[PDB]
Design a protein around this ligand. Structure first.
Ligand SMILES: O=C(O)CC[C@H](NC(=O)c1cccc(CNc2ccc(/C=C3\SC(=S)NC3=O)cc2)c1)C(=O)O
Ligand SMILES: [Cl-]
Ligand SMILES: [Cl-]
Ligand SMILES: [Cl-]
Ligand SMILES: [Cl-]
Ligand SMILES: [Cl-]
Ligand SMILES: [Cl-]
Length: 435
């Protein structure tokens, strides 16, 4: 691409916005930056020579632009951005910029749940083969910070939002792991609009990897598949033990994995399918499956003490992710379940079927706390904050109980991000969980 002499406007700062600023400056192009926030993250790191406008979008700048680079955090439907599109002004995001430059194959991974785990796993498979791999996108480094001539493979986690502004991805292997209701606050044509954004990942992909158990992951019109009882990559249960299989052949007894649970085994299948399609040696890929320990904030045991397990699943920001934590969950005593935050207009009702019996208590907080308590009012308490909920539940915890933060919501109403929410949970668990 040639950006010389263009008027470029970057919308949205933060680390990813800053990576866009740096990308253009290194090519001798001075962009301008706007953000609807008054003091957005990274403002103090923006070089003084870069003009910026904050607290609103600037239509004089947008309508003057030759190229608009939109954060995934700003709606394409924002009237100002919609006006620019109507005027034929080109709008891309950071992932589009990256795709135009990248000089190694790209494995591209999206989905409502699983996408960070599978991205990280494929990265570990590549490391085990001695491949120089750049892993990031929607996690770790923004993609533009991974760009390096010595990189041999990129593995990118991509959101629905990033995909909406991307047109030049030609992935060596692409997947949608699953599609369950999420981000409805940003998709006013509902589940099929959200799906359509994700379906973009398959365009011009060399190999598409689909979930045989989730029809929404399939192109609307020759994909490789993974699934539980069905698929090219699937599971084989053998009398109290489980195997990963590829086309009828056993490749791994899951007792060798550190991760456990069915959805982690289907994440492993998806990661192996992508790694195979990317040409990584099967042997090293299997070895990586045995060494991978999981991500922070993903069903993470932060304290096991005095007969009580305190579990940080703060990464559960939608109903499907909480369902995956609860489905088949074994607790000896009472589950004390923390739910709450910004539910993004989700329907919480699918959780209700997991919340029967005499051994469940709900502690509901944040913007949508009341809607969550309503799932089963008789065993529910509502508080403003997560800290209040923890201090309410802690005196009630008995040996054999589990305390589970799996909140089914975004954290952004009260926290910086789900990591901060998870870290605060862990600090409070350690305080409240020992004498
Ligand atoms: O709890 C969490 O950590 C976050 C919740 C999570 N995140 C998102 O919904 C999400 C959607 C799009 C993009 C991002 C990360 N990047 C980002 C960039 C800019 C913003 C805010 C902007 S940009 C602009 S201009 N004005 C803004 O307010 C927010 C997030 C996050 C979700 O519930 O899945
Ligand atoms: Cl250029
Ligand atoms: Cl505005
Ligand atoms: Cl694009
Ligand atoms: Cl102990
Ligand atoms: Cl029960
Ligand atoms: Cl209290």
């Amino acid at each position: 691409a040639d950006y010389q002499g263009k008027n470029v406007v970057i919308i949205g700062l933060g680390l990813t916005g800053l990576s866009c600023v740096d990308f253009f400056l290194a090519r001798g192009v001075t962009p301008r930056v706007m953000d609807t926030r008054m003091t957005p993250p990274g403002l103090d790191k923006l070089p003084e020579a870069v003009e910026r406008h904050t607290g609103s979008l600037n239509d004089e700048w947008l309508m003057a632009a030759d190229l608009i680079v939109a954060s995934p955090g700003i709606a394409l439907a924002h009237p100002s951005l919609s006006a620019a599109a109507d005027a034929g002004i080109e709008i891309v995001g950071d992932i589009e910029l990256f795709c135009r430059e990248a000089q190694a194959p790209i494995v591209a991974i999206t989905g409502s749940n699983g996408k960070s785990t599978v991205t990280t796993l494929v990265g570990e498979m590549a490391k085990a083969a001695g491949v120089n791999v750049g892993v990031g996108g929607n996690i770790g480094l923004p993609a533009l910070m991974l760009l390096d001539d010595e990189c041999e493979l990129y593995v990118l986690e991509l959101s629905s939002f990033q995909l909406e502004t991307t047109s030049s991805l030609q992935a060596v292997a692409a997947t949608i792991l699953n599609v369950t209701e999420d981000h409805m606050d940003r998709y006013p044509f509902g589940l099929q609009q959200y799906r359509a954004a994700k379906l973009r990942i398959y365009e011009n992909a060399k190999v598409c990897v689909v979930n045989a158990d989730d029809a929404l992951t399939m192109p609307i019109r020759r994909c490789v598949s993974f699934g539980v009882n069905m698929g090219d990559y699937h599971l084989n249960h053998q009398q109290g033990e489980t195997w990963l299989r590829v086309k009828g052949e056993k490749v791994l007894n899951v007792k060798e994995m550190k991760l456990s649970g069915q959805h982690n085994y289907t994440n492993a299948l998806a990661a192996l399918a992508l790694a195979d399609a990317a040409g990584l040696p099967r042997a090293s890929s299997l070895k990586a499956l045995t060494t991978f320990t999981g991500l922070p904030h993903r069903f993470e045991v932060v304290l096991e003490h005095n007969g009580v397990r305190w579990i940080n699943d703060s990464k559960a920001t939608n109903v499907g992710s909480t369902e995956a934590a609860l489905n088949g969950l074994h607790v000896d005593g009472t589950l004390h379940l923390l739910l709450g935050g910004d539910g993004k207009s989700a329907d919480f009702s699918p959780l209700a079927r997991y919340l029967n019996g005499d051994n469940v208590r709900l502690y509901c907080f944040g913007r949508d706390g009341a809607q969550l308590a309503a799932l089963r009012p008789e065993v529910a308490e509502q508080t403003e904050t997560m800290e209040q909920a923890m201090r309410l539940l802690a005196p009630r915890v008995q040996p054999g109980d589990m305390v589970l933060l799996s909140p089914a919501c975004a954290s952004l109403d009260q926290f910086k991000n789900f990591e901060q929410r998870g870290n605060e949970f862990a600090r409070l668990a350690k305080e409240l969980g020992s004498h």
